[PDB]
Design an enzyme around this catalytic site. Structure first.
Site, PDB file in Angstrom:
ATOM      1  N   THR A  77      41.106  36.611  31.080  1.00  0.00           N
ATOM      2  CA  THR A  77      39.706  36.256  31.947  1.00  0.00           C
ATOM      3  C   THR A  77      38.180  38.093  32.146  1.00  0.00           C
ATOM      4  OG1 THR A  77      40.514  37.172  33.637  1.00  0.00           O
ATOM      5  CG2 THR A  77      41.516  34.658  33.018  1.00  0.00           C
ATOM      6  N   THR A  78      38.564  38.799  31.428  1.00  0.00           N
ATOM      7  CA  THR A  78      38.452  39.635  31.549  1.00  0.00           C
ATOM      8  C   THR A  78      37.614  39.667  29.676  1.00  0.00           C
ATOM      9  OG1 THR A  78      39.257  41.451  30.903  1.00  0.00           O
ATOM     10  CG2 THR A  78      38.474  41.496  33.794  1.00  0.00           C
TER      11      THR A  78
ATOM     12  N   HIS B 196      48.064  43.806  36.924  1.00  0.00           N
ATOM     13  CA  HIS B 196      47.160  44.159  37.621  1.00  0.00           C
ATOM     14  C   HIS B 196      46.985  42.612  38.657  1.00  0.00           C
ATOM     15  CE1 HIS B 196      45.862  41.258  34.195  1.00  0.00           C
ATOM     16  NE2 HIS B 196      44.786  41.160  35.153  1.00  0.00           N
TER      17      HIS B 196
ATOM     18  N   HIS C 184      38.189  48.120  36.519  1.00  0.00           N
ATOM     19  CA  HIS C 184      37.290  46.655  36.938  1.00  0.00           C
ATOM     20  C   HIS C 184      39.069  46.333  37.780  1.00  0.00           C
ATOM     21  CE1 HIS C 184      35.085  46.968  33.272  1.00  0.00           C
ATOM     22  NE2 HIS C 184      36.175  47.420  33.002  1.00  0.00           N
TER      23      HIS C 184
ATOM     24  N   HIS D 239      48.925  38.915  38.471  1.00  0.00           N
ATOM     25  CA  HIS D 239      48.496  38.779  36.460  1.00  0.00           C
ATOM     26  C   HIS D 239      49.332  39.490  35.692  1.00  0.00           C
ATOM     27  CE1 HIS D 239      44.564  36.440  36.739  1.00  0.00           C
ATOM     28  NE2 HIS D 239      44.916  35.691  36.950  1.00  0.00           N
TER      29      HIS D 239
ATOM     30  N   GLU E 236      41.324  33.919  41.034  1.00  0.00           N
ATOM     31  CA  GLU E 236      41.301  33.801  39.788  1.00  0.00           C
ATOM     32  C   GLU E 236      40.806  31.567  39.553  1.00  0.00           C
ATOM     33  OE1 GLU E 236      41.576  36.470  36.322  1.00  0.00           O
ATOM     34  OE2 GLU E 236      39.228  36.805  37.115  1.00  0.00           O
TER      35      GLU E 236
ATOM     36  N   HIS F 290      43.780  40.669  40.965  1.00  0.00           N
ATOM     37  CA  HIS F 290      41.874  40.463  41.478  1.00  0.00           C
ATOM     38  C   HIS F 290      42.062  39.778  43.213  1.00  0.00           C
ATOM     39  CE1 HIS F 290      41.100  40.078  36.871  1.00  0.00           C
ATOM     40  NE2 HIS F 290      42.418  39.093  36.727  1.00  0.00           N
TER      41      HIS F 290
HETATM   42  N1  LIG Z   1      43.249  38.709  34.054  1.00  0.00           N
HETATM   43  S1  LIG Z   1      43.867  38.649  32.297  1.00  0.00           S
HETATM   44  O1  LIG Z   1      45.561  39.282  32.749  1.00  0.00           O
HETATM   45  O2  LIG Z   1      43.466  38.430  31.326  1.00  0.00           O
HETATM   46  C1  LIG Z   1      43.416  40.408  32.043  1.00  0.00           C
HETATM   47  C2  LIG Z   1      41.987  41.303  32.546  1.00  0.00           C
HETATM   48  F1  LIG Z   1      41.496  40.930  34.163  1.00  0.00           F
HETATM   49  C3  LIG Z   1      42.206  42.615  33.168  1.00  0.00           C
HETATM   50  F2  LIG Z   1      41.596  43.034  33.784  1.00  0.00           F
HETATM   51  C4  LIG Z   1      43.229  43.443  32.266  1.00  0.00           C
HETATM   52  S2  LIG Z   1      42.753  45.164  32.576  1.00  0.00           S
HETATM   53  O3  LIG Z   1      43.379  45.690  33.691  1.00  0.00           O
HETATM   54  O4  LIG Z   1      43.834  45.907  31.431  1.00  0.00           O
HETATM   55  C5  LIG Z   1      41.207  45.341  31.973  1.00  0.00           C
HETATM   56  C6  LIG Z   1      40.490  45.836  31.952  1.00  0.00           C
HETATM   57  O5  LIG Z   1      40.875  44.957  30.140  1.00  0.00           O
HETATM   58  C7  LIG Z   1      44.283  43.045  30.666  1.00  0.00           C
HETATM   59  N2  LIG Z   1      45.351  43.690  29.924  1.00  0.00           N
HETATM   60  C8  LIG Z   1      45.620  42.962  28.989  1.00  0.00           C
HETATM   61  C9  LIG Z   1      44.630  42.653  27.433  1.00  0.00           C
HETATM   62  C10 LIG Z   1      43.056  43.506  27.304  1.00  0.00           C
HETATM   63  C11 LIG Z   1      43.859  44.110  25.851  1.00  0.00           C
HETATM   64  C12 LIG Z   1      45.141  44.664  25.536  1.00  0.00           C
HETATM   65  C13 LIG Z   1      45.819  43.219  25.729  1.00  0.00           C
HETATM   66  C14 LIG Z   1      46.917  43.070  26.626  1.00  0.00           C
HETATM   67  C15 LIG Z   1      46.505  43.829  27.936  1.00  0.00           C
HETATM   68  C16 LIG Z   1      43.717  41.083  31.289  1.00  0.00           C
HETATM   69  F3  LIG Z   1      44.556  40.784  30.650  1.00  0.00           F
HETATM   70 ZN   LIG Z   2      43.715  39.359  34.757  1.00  0.00          ZN
END
Ligand SMILES: NS(=O)(=O)c1c(F)c(F)c(S(=O)(=O)CCO)c(NC2CCCCCCC2)c1F
Ligand SMILES: [Zn+2]
Length: 257
Positions: free
Chosen positions: A195-196, A91, A61, A116, A103, A93
């Site tokens: 946001t995912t 990470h 992603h 982020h 975003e 976007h």
């Molecule tokens: N935009 S965001 O910060 O809400 C977001 C993402 F877009 C995202 F892509 C991720 S990811 O790289 O881990 C991919 C899909 O999960 C996380 N990471 C958090 C959310 C996932 C569960 C664990 C909590 C801390 C990591 C994530 F938090």
């Molecule tokens: Zn993010």
């Protein structure tokens, strides 16, 4: 299952994750003229001196840089937060074109990308527990505009060819995330969500007013990544952003003005 395509993108997510149509979804448009300066908001405390980066991963992603979060090494405090939030990963976007990719938007303006930095509240013991809480996570968001290179990003850009496809990781030790911050820590904040998927409403968002500058060549390297795994048809990892969601019964607060 979920992704960013026509057939599995943000318009579809509500079928597997009905909270997509919830009351505190992210991102949002930040209307600068309607945000409330709150004199009682504290300066943000970003304490990244002891940060231990471990690994970089293409998760299909986006890509993520992960940190050791088993001790208070890299933490976010202050600002709108109560208590101490430990950095677990960052990470990005980004877009297919320099005029889209972020975003959050500011007065409907899109940036080329958004960084982020994801942190979890140490009162909940681990990030999995923290995601189940309304104040479990704090995400620090930083806009990227295309202009001058960001020297502190180059170490990240240069390893991306080794994690081109979904599920690839590489060692990524000794990376200093302080090199990704702008000069000012002035911010907006509001309660929102991941946001995912799973789109859980567990995030205090803190979005910095000052973007960072990255070069056109740095963002072109992000667009070389692939959503697909190795040995699968190539789909460039671009436009991995969720659009702005309705603000509903929320007020965005500003730490400045
Ligand atoms: N935009 S965001 O910060 O809400 C977001 C993402 F877009 C995202 F892509 C991720 S990811 O790289 O881990 C991919 C899909 O999960 C996380 N990471 C958090 C959310 C996932 C569960 C664990 C909590 C801390 C990591 C994530 F938090
Ligand atoms: Zn993010």
């Amino acid at each position: 299952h979920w992704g960013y395509g026509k057939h599995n993108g943000p318009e579809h997510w509500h079928k597997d994750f009905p909270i997509a149509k919830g009351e505190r979804q992210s991102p949002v448009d930040i209307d600068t003229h309607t945000a409330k300066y709150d004199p009682s908001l504290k300066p943000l405390s970003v304490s990244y001196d002891q940060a231990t980066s471990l690994r970089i991963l293409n998760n299909g992603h986006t890509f993520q840089v992960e940190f050791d979060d088993s001790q208070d090494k890299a933490v976010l405090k202050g600002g709108p937060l109560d208590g101490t939030y430990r950095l677990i990963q960052f990470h990005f976007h980004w877009g297919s074109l320099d005029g889209q990719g972020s975003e959050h938007t500011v007065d409907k303006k899109k940036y080329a990308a958004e960084l982020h930095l994801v942190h979890w509240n140490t009162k909940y013991g681990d990030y999995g527990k923290a995601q189940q809480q309304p104040d479990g996570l704090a995400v620090l968001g930083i806009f990227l505009k295309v202009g001058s290179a960001k020297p502190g990003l180059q170490k990240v850009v240069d390893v991306l060819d080794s994690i081109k496809t979904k599920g690839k990781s590489a060692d990524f030790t000794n990376f200093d995330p302080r090199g990704l911050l702008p000069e000012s820590l002035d911010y907006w904040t509001y309660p929102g969500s991941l946001t995912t998927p799973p789109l859980t409403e567990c995030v205090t968002w803190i979005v910095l007013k000052e973007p960072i500058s990255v070069s056109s060549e740095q963002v072109l390297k992000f667009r070389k990544l692939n959503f697909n795994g190795e040995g699968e048809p190539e789909e460039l990892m671009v436009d991995n952003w969720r659009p702005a969601q309705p603000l509903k019964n929320r007020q965005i607060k500003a730490s400045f003005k």
